[PDB]
Structure formats: structure tokens, C-alpha cells
């Protein structure tokens, strides 16, 4: 009842900056989204202005901080949560590869799994991301921690419908000019289910994905979001040969950056919106979950510890009345379910 879960995938985001180790406190300053002539301006990651409704018990930490680092580790232990989907952006810096590094050697310690979350970086297509796969496996998939299936490495691919079906055919289809399948680069590939089934079967199908998830945290946000379409969305993946990997997660708020936003708000309910979500994963059947998010602090869905605070500047939300690791500590509950039901 304490092992990690190997089916479990929590999104991590690695973006954050400090004065310790970066020099500056990247993400927690953060441009306000103009609502779709606006200065909306800047939020300026100052101890008592950052770029969250909430506000991390680890403070404005660095994501290259190995002390911040085997913190996080010791969080999705409790969590339960086995691989860490981590978010690339294809920055092609040296940050970026330390980063990496650093956070394959902290997961490690910890008998976590690191899998990549691809996203929609610019000039993204099929042929950049087979040589951005192609790096990846090359430069990670000897490390200890980098997560394999059954053999196969797994990709999330956000965004996946910016790239029409044909494109992806030439990639993932086993006959596709560009095939990864069959060659030392296969891997699983789970692109993003949107919209109504009418438009995501046969995209899935045409763009040979091996699977799907929905990421988004805000129950409605899409079709793919909506609990409630699960039990089909898993029938449907189960008659097609493909992995459903419905994503759950504890709230939404991102009215500090897109303060035009509210509609898209969830509130926790001191857990039961977390609860609520999670069941239906459960009762759907799927065979692995996704969790939105361990630390995506700008759209207010982290399970990381978050603690009161009251600054001149802002009044921020927080887990009371519960404790700041409570959503780690759920989270574990919620993966023994899982388990259970596997
Ligand atoms: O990881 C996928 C996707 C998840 C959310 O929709 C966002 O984290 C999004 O990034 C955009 O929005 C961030 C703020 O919420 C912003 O900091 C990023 O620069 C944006 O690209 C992720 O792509």
C-alpha cells in the first residue's frame, strides 16, 4: 500500500527559476494574457507577487535546484505517482539540458520514471519531432529513470490535433515514410483527445496514435474533459486497440494570469473535486491515469504542497482546511484505488 505505481503519470513542469541557482525567478514572473490596445502588464515574481492564485510551502524555487529537486522526488514517493511526465519545449540550451539531467538523477534516487511531455513548440512537425525523439531516446534512454512500457518509451503529445492526420501517418503508421515503428525509436504515442467523437475517432485512428489522454484539470473544458463521456472514451479505446489515459486533477484557477478566465475556474472543495474526478477514471477501467498537475502553479492545478499566504500585494488561495500535503497524500489514496480495481 506504499509502492509507487508505475501506471501513474503526473505532469511536471521544470520552467521555474530562482536567485539561488538561475539568477532570476523564472515562470513566477510571467507576462497577464490579454483577453481574446491592452497593456494588460506583468506579474513580477516578487516574494509577494507571483504568477499563482496559490502559493508553494517551497517558495519561488529553481527547477535546477537539486535540493528543490530530491524534495519533489520525496513528493510523488508519498504521492505514489511512479513516472513523471515532464514538459519539453525544445529550447535546445544548455538550462535545458542540465535541467533534464539534474531531474533524471534526483527521480532515480527515488525509483521514480521520467517520460516526456512534447509540446507545441515552435515549427513543431513530424519530421523535427522524429529528430527530437531520436535525441531523447538517444541522449536519455540509457539513464536509469527514463520510463519504458512494455520495451517502448511513452510520449505525450499536447496539442496533437495542430498536425493534421496525414502528417502524423508518415510517422507513426508502420508503413509511414518516416516510421519510427519497428525501429529502435518506436515508442508509445499518446496524443490529445479534444473534441467530440465524431472528430477524435477518426483522428486517432488516421494519425495511428497508440493512444490518447485529456489532459485538461477543469471538468467541461472539452468533450475529453467531461468525466461523464469516460466509460465510452475507454469502449471506444478498447474496441480500437488503444491506451486511454484520462487525466484527473485537483482544481483550476489561472485568473492571476488570464484574469478574463474565470468561466474556466473548478474549485477544490477541500478535496471532493479531486475525489470526484479521480472515481471516474477508476470506474471508467482504464489501465493508466494521468494527473493534472504536480506543479503547474500559473493554472492553479498543482498537487505540490501550497501554504496560506497574505502579502500587501494579494490574499492567495490555499488548502485550508487542509494540510498543505494533502493532495499528495489523497493522491496516494487514490492510486491504491486505482490499484485495486487494475
Ligand atoms: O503542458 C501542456 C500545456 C498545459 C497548459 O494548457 C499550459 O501549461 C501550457 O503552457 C502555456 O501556458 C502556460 C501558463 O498556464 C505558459 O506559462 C506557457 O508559456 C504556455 O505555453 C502547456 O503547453
Request: proline share 6%.
Amino acid at each position: 500500500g506504499t509502492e509507487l505505481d508505475y501506471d501513474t503519470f503526473c505532469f511536471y513542469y521544470d520552467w521555474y527559476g530562482s536567485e539561488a541557482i538561475d539568477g532570476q525567478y523564472r515562470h513566477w514572473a510571467h507576462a497577464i494574457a490579454p483577453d481574446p490596445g491592452q497593456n494588460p502588464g506583468t506579474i513580477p515574481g516578487t516574494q509577494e507577487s507571483i504568477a499563482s492564485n496559490f502559493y508553494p510551502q517551497l517558495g519561488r524555487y529553481s527547477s535546477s535546484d537539486p535540493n528543490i529537486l530530491t524534495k519533489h522526488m520525496d513528493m510523488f514517493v508519498m504521492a505514489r505517482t511512479g513516472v513523471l511526465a515532464l514538459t519539453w519545449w525544445n529550447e535546445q540550451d544548455e538550462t535545458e539540458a542540465k535541467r533534464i539531467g539534474l531531474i533524471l538523477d534526483a527521480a532515480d534516487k527515488k525509483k521514480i520514471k521520467v517520460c516526456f511531455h512534447l509540446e507545441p513548440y515552435p515549427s513543431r512537425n513530424v519530421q523535427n519531432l522524429r529528430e527530437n525523439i531520436v535525441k531523447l531516446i538517444t541522449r536519455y534512454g540509457n539513464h536509469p529513470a527514463f520510463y519504458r512500457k512494455d520495451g517502448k518509451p511513452l510520449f505525450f503529445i499536447y496539442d496533437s490535433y495542430l498536425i493534421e492526420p496525414s502528417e502524423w501517418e508518415k510517422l507513426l503508421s508502420p508503413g509511414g515514410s518516416i516510421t519510427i515503428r519497428n525501429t529502435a525509436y518506436d515508442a508509445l504515442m499518446i496524443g490529445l483527445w479534444t473534441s467530440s467523437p465524431t472528430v477524435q475517432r477518426p483522428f486517432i485512428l488516421n494519425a495511428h496514435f497508440d493512444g490518447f489522454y485529456t489532459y485538461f484539470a477543469a471538468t467541461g473544458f472539452t468533450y475529453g474533459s467531461t468525466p461523464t463521456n469516460w466509460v465510452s472514451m475507454q469502449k471506444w479505446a478498447k474496441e480500437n486497440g488503444k491506451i486511454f489515459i484520462p487525466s484527473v486533477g485537483p482544481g483550476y484557477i489561472d485568473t492571476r494570469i488570464r484574469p478574463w478566465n474565470g468561466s474556466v475556474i473548478r474549485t477544490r472543495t477541500d478535496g471532493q473535486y479531486y475525489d470526484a474526478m479521480y472515481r471516474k477514471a477508476i470506474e471508467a477501467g482504464v489501465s493508466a491515469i494521468s494527473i493534472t498537475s504536480f506543479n503547474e502553479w500559473h493554472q492553479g492545478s498543482q498537487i505540490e504542497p501550497a501554504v496560506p499566504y497574505t502579502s500587501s500585494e494579494f490574499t492567495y488561495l490555499d488548502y485550508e482546511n487542509r494540510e498543505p500535503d494533502y493532495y499528495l497524500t489523497r493522491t496516494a489514496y487514490w492510486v491504491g484505488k486505482f490499484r485495486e480495481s487494475k
